[PDB]
Structure 1
Amino acid sequence: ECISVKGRIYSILKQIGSGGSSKVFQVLNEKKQIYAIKYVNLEEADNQTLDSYRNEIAYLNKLQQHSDKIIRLYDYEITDQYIYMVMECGNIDLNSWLKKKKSIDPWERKSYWKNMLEAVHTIHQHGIVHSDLKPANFLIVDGMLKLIDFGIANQMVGTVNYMPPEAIKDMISPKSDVWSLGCILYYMTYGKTPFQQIINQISKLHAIIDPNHEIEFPDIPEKDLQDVLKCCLKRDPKQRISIPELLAHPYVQIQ
């Protein structure tokens, strides 16, 4: 069958994943060019939800022309009943790709880390702190990671392995995103997130906020990489490294 978006027929190759009231479709336009179409049903959406959906559409549309490490939004159609978003089509999300891989090319890890910083840097430059970063938020598109959401979408099996200590103690600033990026890199380096071994979630959160629970950093060839991980995973936000600092770090600069 088909989807019309702004008077353009797209044909559905398949559904990517399988959401409820939100659905992503791999599609082709008339000229057989591939896109991804996000469909959202709005009939059960309150005003606050609608407001945040529009806000994320606004920022995604706006930040596009600043970085190609943000997913390209070509067009959208928005009424009171639904939303269609025509988007650049990616191969696979970072989480799915990591799950089926024992190791990673050291060069590729570094390259992906550059992309992530560029993307997160960009949203910071327009006042947006994501605050819920995890590998699923990134999409591989021609050997590039692209950030596919900004975490503005509201009440639309979780995970707390990427959560920064200051969010837990507070019961959040650009540094919060650095911690999570730090957990994503740690994972790509050591094959597991820092506190992955703690299956009890209440304990896990205590482990994250506990100074006396020291995070292990097994020695590796890339001593720069090791340093990046230590700097990103410093519990005190003030002591934690910023994104502009990470962009000047040897790990990302030195060939």
Structure 2
Amino acid sequence: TVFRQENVDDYYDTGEELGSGQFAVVKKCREKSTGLQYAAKFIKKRRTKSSRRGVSREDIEREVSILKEIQHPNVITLHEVYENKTDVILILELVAGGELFDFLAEKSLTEEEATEFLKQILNGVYYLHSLQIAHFDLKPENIMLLDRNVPKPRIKIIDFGLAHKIDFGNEFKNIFGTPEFVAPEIVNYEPLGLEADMWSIGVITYILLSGASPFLGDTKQETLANVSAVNYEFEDEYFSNTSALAKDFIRRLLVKDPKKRMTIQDSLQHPWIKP
């Protein structure tokens, strides 16, 4: 599939930088014809077949195809796609309140503040999983707030660079995100399904409540070793005044066997979550 090959600067003015990754930069922009504002992601294309600098077109097309499916308040939307010889440029929905990650660093949350975020994340993931879409890169850096200066911030899930459709209950591709948040099946190179995101959600919830990362070791390999061995515990110093029901929620997500792990529908019916 090809995209719009006009010069993006003919239609948009860029401004402040919003995000920056391995082969991509995200820039605030304004569409000339409407005055409406967006976030433009410039993804570097592969220049040769066997290269490792830039993103394969197969991966770019998978990501664009998944993004075009999305219309939900808790998930980022895609407006347009441009390309040239060097880049594919995604015109994405603008979210101006920064990462949940940096929001958390400004402060630990109460359980209520924790669940106001979590409920939105869960609703977003419920939408995604209903479309059989596995995100595979859920973490606080990939959760963006619309406005961080409100009591109950609204969030959107971003970064579908590792996302895959799961038409057969499981996928077996080259998939590997951030060690602190990846499920054991990812660490062990097993077939992956929607269950992996649920594990990530348990890690996120642990972090929201405690301000601590449950599997983090002194190095990437140690973290992965801890993940596979399910080497985590609720430290009394962090959780002594956290409800046992919140611990139950997390404990039912941080399960090694994906088949025994809570599904997104289960997580929504959990007493800690359910009204």
TM-score, length-scaled by structure 1 = 0.82
CA distance in 2, matches of 1:137, 1:181: 12
Provide the residue aligned with 1:203 in structure 2: 222
Matches within 5 A, 1:161-176: 161-170=180-189, 172-176=192-196
Going from structure 1 to structure 2, the CA distance change for 1:15 and 1:205 (only over 3 Å counts) comes to closer
Shift of the alpha carbon at 1:68? 1.8
Residues 161, 195 of structure 1: 8 Å contact kept? yes
Provide the residue aligned with 2:263 in structure 1: 242
Confirm whether residue 9 of structure 1 aligns to residue 11 of structure 2: yes
Give structure 2 stretches of 5+ with no counterpart. 1-5, 148-152, 165-172
Which structure has the highest helix share of the two? 1
Amino acid at match of 1:174: L
CA distance in 1, matches of 2:114, 2:69: 29
Shift of the alpha carbon at 1:250? 2.1
Shift of the alpha carbon at 1:9? 2.9
Amino acid at match of 2:24: S
Provide the residue aligned with 1:73 in structure 2: 78
SS at match of 2:273: helix
TM-score, length-scaled by structure 2 = 0.77
Amino acid at match of 1:163: V
Q: Give the alignment's Cα RMSD to 1 decimal.
A: 2.9
Going from structure 1 to structure 2, the CA distance change for 1:234 and 1:152 (only over 3 Å counts) comes to closer
CA distance in 2, matches of 1:23, 1:93: 15
Residues 45, 85 of structure 2: 8 Å contact kept? yes
The CA deviation string for residues 90-132 of structure 1, in whole angstroms up to 9 with x for no partner, is 120222222x223225333212111211222222222222233
Confirm whether residue 94 of structure 1 aligns to residue 100 of structure 2: yes
Matches within 5 A, 1:1-255: 5=8, 9-19=11-21, 21-30=23-32, 32-42=35-45, 44=47, 46=49, 49-64=56-71, 67-90=72-95, 91-98=97-104, 100-142=105-147, 143-150=153-160, 151-152=162-163, 159-170=178-189, 172-196=192-216, 198-210=217-229, 213=231, 215-216=233-234, 218-254=239-275
Give structure 1 stretches of 5+ with no counterpart. none
The CA deviation string for residues 40-61 of structure 1, in whole angstroms up to 9 with x for no partner, is 2325264981012012111111
Q: Report % sequence identity.
A: 25
Shift of the alpha carbon at 1:228? 0.8
The total of aligned residue pairs comes to: 244
